[PDB]
Amino acid sequence: SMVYMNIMMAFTVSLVGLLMYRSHLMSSLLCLEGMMLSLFVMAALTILNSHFTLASMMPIILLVFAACEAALGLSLLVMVSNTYGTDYVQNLNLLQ
Amino acid sequence: NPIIFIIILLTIMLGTIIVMISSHWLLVWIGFEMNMLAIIPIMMKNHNPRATEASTKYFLTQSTASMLLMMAVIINLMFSGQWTVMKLFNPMASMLMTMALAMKLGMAPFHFWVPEVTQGIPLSSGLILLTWQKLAPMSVLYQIFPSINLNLILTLSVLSILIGGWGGLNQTQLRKIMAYSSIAHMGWMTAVLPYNPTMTLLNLIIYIIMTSTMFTMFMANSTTTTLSLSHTWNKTPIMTVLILATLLSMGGLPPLSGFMPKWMIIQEMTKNNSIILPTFMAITALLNLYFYMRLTYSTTLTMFPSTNNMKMKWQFPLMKKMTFLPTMVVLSTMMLPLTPMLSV
Amino acid sequence: RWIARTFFDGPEKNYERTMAILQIEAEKAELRLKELEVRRLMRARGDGPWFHYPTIDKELIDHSPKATPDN
Amino acid sequence: PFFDVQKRLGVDLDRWMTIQSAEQPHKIPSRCHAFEKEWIECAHGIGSIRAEK
Amino acid sequence: HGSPNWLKVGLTLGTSVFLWIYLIKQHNEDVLEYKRRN
Amino acid sequence: AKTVLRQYWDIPEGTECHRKTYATTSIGGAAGLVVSAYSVALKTPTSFLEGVARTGRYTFTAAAIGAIFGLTSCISAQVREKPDDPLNYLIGGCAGGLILGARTRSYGIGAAACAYMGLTAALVKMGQLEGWQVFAEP
Amino acid sequence: MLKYIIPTIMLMPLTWLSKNNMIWVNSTAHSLLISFTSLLLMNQFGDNSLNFSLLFFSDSLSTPLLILTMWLLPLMLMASQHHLSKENLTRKKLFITMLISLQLFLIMTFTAMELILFYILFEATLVPTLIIITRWGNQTERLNAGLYFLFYTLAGSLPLLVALIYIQNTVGSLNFLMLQYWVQPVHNSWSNVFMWLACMMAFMVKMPLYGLHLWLPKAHVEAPIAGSMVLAAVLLKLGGYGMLRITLILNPMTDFMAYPFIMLSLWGMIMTSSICLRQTDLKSLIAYSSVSHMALVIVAILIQTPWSYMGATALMIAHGLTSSMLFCLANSNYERIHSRTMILARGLQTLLPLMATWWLLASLTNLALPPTINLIGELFVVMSTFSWSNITIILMGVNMVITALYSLYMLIMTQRGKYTYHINNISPSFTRENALMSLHILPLLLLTLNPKIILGPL
Amino acid sequence: RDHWVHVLVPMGFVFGYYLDRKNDEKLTAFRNKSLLYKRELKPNEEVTW
Amino acid sequence: WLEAILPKTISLAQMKASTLVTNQKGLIKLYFLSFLITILISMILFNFHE
Amino acid sequence: GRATFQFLPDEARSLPPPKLTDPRLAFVGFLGYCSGLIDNAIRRRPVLLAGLHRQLLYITSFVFVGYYLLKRQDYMYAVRDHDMFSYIKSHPEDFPEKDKKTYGEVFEEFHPV
Incomplete structure (x- = not known):
């Protein structure tokens, strides 16, 4: 019913100017690691309100990578700001 | 170190074998979710301040590319509530599939990327592995094949083979020149795709070979165009007849095999009485040729041998399976009306 | 007289050798008109095993008496 | 290209989680369960291109 | 005293001795199959 | 969407x-908008009001042409025989293209626009x- | 048939397989022999044309045209020898290979049995020619002749393959010309013009109209040593005959639009020969002949009604020789004096007396004295194209004037006193100079004795 | 040695000229035509085909 | 005037490959804002939802 | 077709098979026979005939493989046809029998010059 239009307007959290930008990359990477819960919850209802009884594990597997992988891509964000000290998306150097 | 590099480099194809083998929407997520997990360290190996400002412009551009998909999987879990792998039962699914999946392949838009990564990965060794990621997605599009809005997958095609064409005429670095005109050949195979989707793969294999045999040749030291001038008077001239026996065949001219995909593809795209589409593709791959000419006027014109440069030593690279391919990348046209009935 | 019988032949070959290879032909324009009257246009039937697609496998369904009286 | 190995040899990779009615370990149904075995019964020997119509 | 490996040399020869043998082993067998089947 | 044509072509x-020329x-x-979308997105445009102005200007510039183009035809498409014919409907192009050439002066454009x-x-x-x-199917 | 492709491909390892300098004489010796095979089974019918295989009728067609194609090969190594002796043998082994690699397809083409072997072999050159132009050029303007030679030839010949694959699946099978015995016509539409226009314009871009010839003098002015492939590229061009296989049929009944190809090339025929009078570079001066009385065939072919094919065939092989041989003179006289500027060479005819009668018999066959093939190839043009409309007698009657001032001005420029400063030009035309310059005027005039062997079916 | 390089190659001819004779046996399929064109009673049609 | 009209094609295109490279240089923000225009503009435009 | 992910099924028994001396199988590995000669030449062998143990084992490979692959190709064009006639045979309503008319009948255009 209504709970399917919220949360959906929430899953436009993408909003992409705020997905790569502006600086403090950690804000961009943040709205990514919370782009989940729009994928999770939304898929923790349709599975639940009707009894699938089987795909019920799927919600668990939507995290176990969403944490595993998104925690990888954090790593690079040390390598960027190790050599700098400010992330600041404004580093372009490799060009085209 | 050296063992694992064969554990990693094995897990990739295991990432893409669960893609082609599966019945089940979840697995085609996990399947090419663990490439963006298992690709990344290969970029690194020499730990430089590009690869690390490269794979981070790659990462978050294949992160959402995936993470939209999972939103267009769980739409038709609502409607019809049957996973598996077949037409998507609802238009907001497909239009959120195909034009958010074009990110991994990148098509007509969604490429400010393919030149920003392929350029300036310090590792040119390969970078032949960016011929896998052409091969994971297609092994969805062949299945979903009878659902597309059909006004799109052409509209990303025809805005592609154009936009990847003009992209390079302005380029010098020859890692880019392959980066460009590798959007191009993504224009032919997904322009066909709703009509008779085999005779796509035909263009897919003939592509994996030709771009393959380039790099293995571009591996000795070769990097910048004006380091391919110092080539024939230095390294070996039997190399130059090679790089002229392919770069020409790759845009294609009928006595070679590079003419083999077009010649067959248009048998298909007319006979469906669309004859005003293919000319414009057929005619646009023309000025896709003027990279290669003017690339090939670098090496046969004896241009100012580098300097006093004396390489008296022989070679010890791995040419592995290069001593085959440009007898199959060239001479196969005379052979085959198989490719339409062989893989089918 | 000497040459014609030394080298080539008359209309016992280059005539009625064309008779020969135009039955290697007019059967090649019979079978390119029946693809395009079948392949391209099957059509709405999807009858013959050509445009045939996967649907679902009714083997994996279950008939047993699962527990809830109404379902 | 979809090879379908799990058809040739014996293993089940997935094929179980797939649809709304298969097992459900203690045999408990879904709400719309009874309409699956109705709708799959319709299109099976079909080739799905006439199924839609 | 030419110095190849004298380890592998002859494998490629020996291997082809297998292949053509095995090739015709499948061929000289399969030829009759057509007639055995037809 | 696709139908703008459908009442245009009927x-x-x-x-x-x-x-x-009302609907054309x-x-x-x-289409003047879409070029104004990548204009400021792909090219920089740091201007609160200035930027806005620039965008608008470019957009309107592009816009000029569709208006006259419907007109240069259906005028002459009326006045000769009163159908439209493969010759008749050309005419809107050349003078129509000249608008672009009338802008950003000619000699190397105004002909080409009129031409192509x-x-x-x-x-x-x-x-x-x-x-x-x-765009078809069997 | 394989009687031909097999020995001529057997030639291919007759060359490198040989020793040092024996190579030239090795292959020139054999390459002549094949000419016995050339005639051998050929010059059969005649009536009810020869087709000896499924996908080959070598040439029956009364377009024999193939005997020449097998001439010009061992006229090259006598031609090409001059400055190619100055680089390495493994490269000299190449230049003889690709040059053959051309000769192998021109035997494949002109037979082809069909349309679709023609095309892929109609485009199958430009791999071997383009490589001879760019390497072994002279000036540095060559690099542009590389492109311009493509981007026309290939530019519009792709619309063939859109059209010829459109016919294959429309009416029956194009697999064979010799079955047109079902052909419906082409009446009219805004679609069919394009069909006729797609099945045509690819051919025009080879034998030039007065538009889109912009490449022809670009490639010839600057082009390999001897005219080594410049003799071959004067075969390639005329080989656009295939318009004779199409326009006879396969849309017969549109002549409706012929006129923009008539009045466009018919006023160029009176034209580009006239822009050839003030030329200061000699290998340009001949390059514009080659347009002119070649482009007369395009008003011979479009018009139906034989007495044109009587006269249109004799022309393809008319200048096939004369226009060949002139590029052989202007080469030689260039060996000795290294400018191609026409002015510079004057005061000859004293110093090379025997080569006097060589210029003359060449420049006399553009004049087309009545008895030779040239006029009997032009006066079947004028007889039908007169009946078209009486007024064609004027322009193409003017062609017969400006061309006469045209030719002489090239000879009579080499009759003057000049001793001037040249200490060069000693060599009194060592035999190859006058040997390869023969094997043209001997075979050319000769045919006038029994000139029923050059004619179409009509 | 004996110069295999030389005229051994012209033997390619009769090599080939035989191949043009390989087909005539499979092109036999019409011995019957009205244009004389007979293959009527004679031991002539019998040869060459 | 034969060489103006056709080689106009040469210096026609070779300029448009200066607007597809020069003006795209850098600024990872600037791409990403432009995938968004593209992903909405596919909604309103055409068949894509129909 | 059926028996999916099979190189070839059991039904291919009834095909000739494509035995040797066909030009292709000879040609197959010819393009390898010009491949072997390369294999030397890249490294400055500089033999142009080097060890026959590399200069062979190619020719062995191709024609075997070229052969073992041509066995299924010819198959596929058979199952293509077989599924056509058997459809063309039924539904004769979609397959008319055209009548026979010589020319006492047809007019063409008729447009001479």
Whole structure:
């Protein structure tokens, strides 16, 4: 019913100017690691309100990578700001 | 170190074998979710301040590319509530599939990327592995094949083979020149795709070979165009007849095999009485040729041998399976009306 | 007289050798008109095993008496 | 290209989680369960291109 | 005293001795199959 | 969407020349936006009001052409025989292209616009006139 | 048939397989022999044309045209020898290979049995020619002749393959010309013009109209040593005959639009020969002949009604020789004096007396004295194209004037006193100079004795 | 040695000229035509085909 | 005037490959804002939802 | 077709098979026979005939493989046909029998010059 239009307007959290930008990359990477819960919850209802009884594990597997992988891509964000000290998306150097 | 590099480099194809083998929407997520997990360290190996400002412009551009998909999987879990792998039962699914999946392949838009990564990965060794990621997605599009809005997958095609064409005429670095005109050949195979989707793969294999045999040749030291001038008077001239026996065949001219995909593809795209589409593709791959000419006027014109440069030593690279391919990348046209009935 | 019988032949070959290879032909324009009257246009039937697609496998369904009286 | 190995040899990779009615370990149904075995019964020997119509 | 490996040399020869043998082993067998089947 | 054509291609067909440049300033006026979308996105435009102004200017510039183009035809599409014909409907191209050439001075453009944007007008009508299809299925 | 492709491919390892300098004489010796095979089974019918295989009728067609194609090969190594002796043998082994690699397809083409072997072999050159132009050029303007030679030839010949694949699946099978015995016509539409226009314009871009010839003098002015492939590229061009296989049929009944190809090339025929009078570079001066009385065939072919094919065939092989041989003179006289500027060479005819009668018999066959093939190839043009409309007698009657001032001005420029400063030009035309310059005027005039062997079916 | 390089190659001819004779046996399929064109009673049609 | 009209094609295109490279240089923000225009503009435009 | 992910099924028994001396199988590995000669030449062998143990084992490979692959190709064009006639045979309503008319009948255009 209504709970399917919220949360959906929430899953436009993408909003992409705020997905790569502006600086403090950690804000961009943040709205990514919370782009989940729009994928999770939304898929923790349709599975639940009707009894699938089987795909019920799927919600668990939507995290176990969403944490595993998104925690990888954090790593690079040390390598960027190790050599700098400010992330600041404004580093372009490799060009085209 | 050296063992694992064969554990990693094995897990990739295991990432893409669960893609082609599966019945089940979840697995085609996990399947090419663990490439963006298992690709990344290969970029690194020499730990430089590009690869690390490269794979981070790659990462978050294949992160959402995936993470939209999972939103267009769980739409038709609502409607019809049957996973598996077949037409998507609802238009907001497909239009959120195909034009958010074009990110991994990148098509007509969604490429400010393919030149920003392929350029300036310090590792040119390969970078032949960016011929896998052409091969994971297609092994969805062949299945979903009878659902597309059909006004799109052409509209990303025809805005592609154009936009990847003009992209390079302005380029010098020859890692880019392959980066460009590798959007191009993504224009032919997904322009066909709703009509008779085999005779796509035909263009897919003939592509994996030709771009393959380039790099293995571009591996000795070769990097910048004006380091391919110092080539024939230095390294070996039997190399130059090679790089002229392919770069020409790759845009294609009928006595070679590079003419083999077009010649067959248009048998298909007319006979469906669309004859005003293919000319414009057929005619646009023309000025896709003027990279290669003017690339090939670098090496046969004896241009100012580098300097006093004396390489008296022989070679010890791995040419592995290069001593085959440009007898199959060239001479196969005379052979085959198989490719339409062989893989089918 | 000497040459014609030394080298080539008359209309016992280059005539009625064309008779020969135009039955290697007019059967090649019979079978390119029946693809395009079948392949391209099957059509709405999807009858013959050509445009045939996967649907679902009714083997994996279950008939047993699962527990809830109404379902 | 979809090879379908799990058809040739014996293993089940997935094929179980797939649809709304298969097992459900203690045999408990879904709400719309009874309409699956109705709708799959319709299109099976079909080739799905006439199924839609 | 030419110095190849004298380890592998002859494998490629020996291997082809297998292949053509095995090739015709499948061929000289399969030829009759057509007639055995037809 | 696709239908803007559908009422464009149905009713007027050579007559009611006022609605025919009424709806055919929409298209060439519509596509002016999309170029104004990548203009400031892909090219920088640091200007609160200045930027806005620049954008608008470019957009309107692009827009000019669709308006006259419907008109330069259905006028002459009315006045000769009162149908439209593969020659008749060219005319909107050359003078129509000259608007662009009238802008950002000619000598190397105004001919080409009149030339090529001339060449590619006729095909449209000539296209449906023989029943051509760009995007089809068996 | 394989009687031909097999020995001529057997030639291919007759060359490198040989020793040092024996190579030239090795292959020139054999390459002549094949000419016995050339005639051998050929010059059979005649009536009810020869087709000896499924996908080959070598040439029956009364377009024999193939005997020449097998001439010009061992006229090259006598031609090409001059400055190619100055680089390495493994490269000299190449230049003889690709040059053959051309000769192998021109035997494949002109037979082809069909349309679709023609095309892929109609485009199958430009791999071997383009490589001879760019390497072994002279000036540095060559690099542009590389492109311009493509981007026309290939530019519009792709619309063939859109059209010829459109016919294959429309009416029956194009697999064979010799079955047109079902052909419906082409009446009219805004679609069919294009069909006729797509099945045509690819051919025009080879034998030039007065538009889109912009490449022809670009490639010839600057082009390999001897005219080594410049003799071959004067075979390639005329080989656009295939318009004779199409326009006879396969849309017969549109002549409706012929007129923009008539009045466009018919006023160029009176034209580009006239822009050839003030030329200061000699290998340009001949390059514009080659347009002119070649472009007369395009008004011979479009018109139906034989007495044109009587006269249109004799022309393809008319200048096939004369226009060949002139590029052989202007080469030689260039060996000695290294400018191609026409002015510079004057005061000859004293110093090379025997080569006097060589210029003359060449420049006399553009004049087309009545008895030779040239006029009997032009006066079947004028007889039908007169009946078209009486007024064609004027322009193409003017062609017969400006061309006479045209030719002489090239000879009579080499009759003057000049001793001037040249200490060069000693060599009194060592035999190859006058040997390879023969094997043209001997075979050319000769045919006038029994000139029923050059004619179409009509 | 004996110069295999030389005229051994012209033997390619009769090599080939035989191949043009390989087909005539499979092109036999019409011995019957009205244009004389007979293959009527004679031991002539019998040869060459 | 034969060489103006056709080689105009040469210096026609070779300029448009200066607007597809020069003006795209850098600024990872600037791409990403432009995938968004593209992903909405596919909604309103055409068949894509129909 | 059926028996999916099979190189070839059991039904291919009834095909000739494609035995040797066909030009292709000879040609197959010819393009390898010009491949072997390369294999030397890249490294400055500089033999142009080097060890026959590399200069062979190619020719062995191709024609075997070229052969073992041509066995299924010819198959596929058979199952293509077989599924056509058997459809063309039924639904004769979609397959008319055309009548026979010589020319006492047809007019053409008729447009001479």
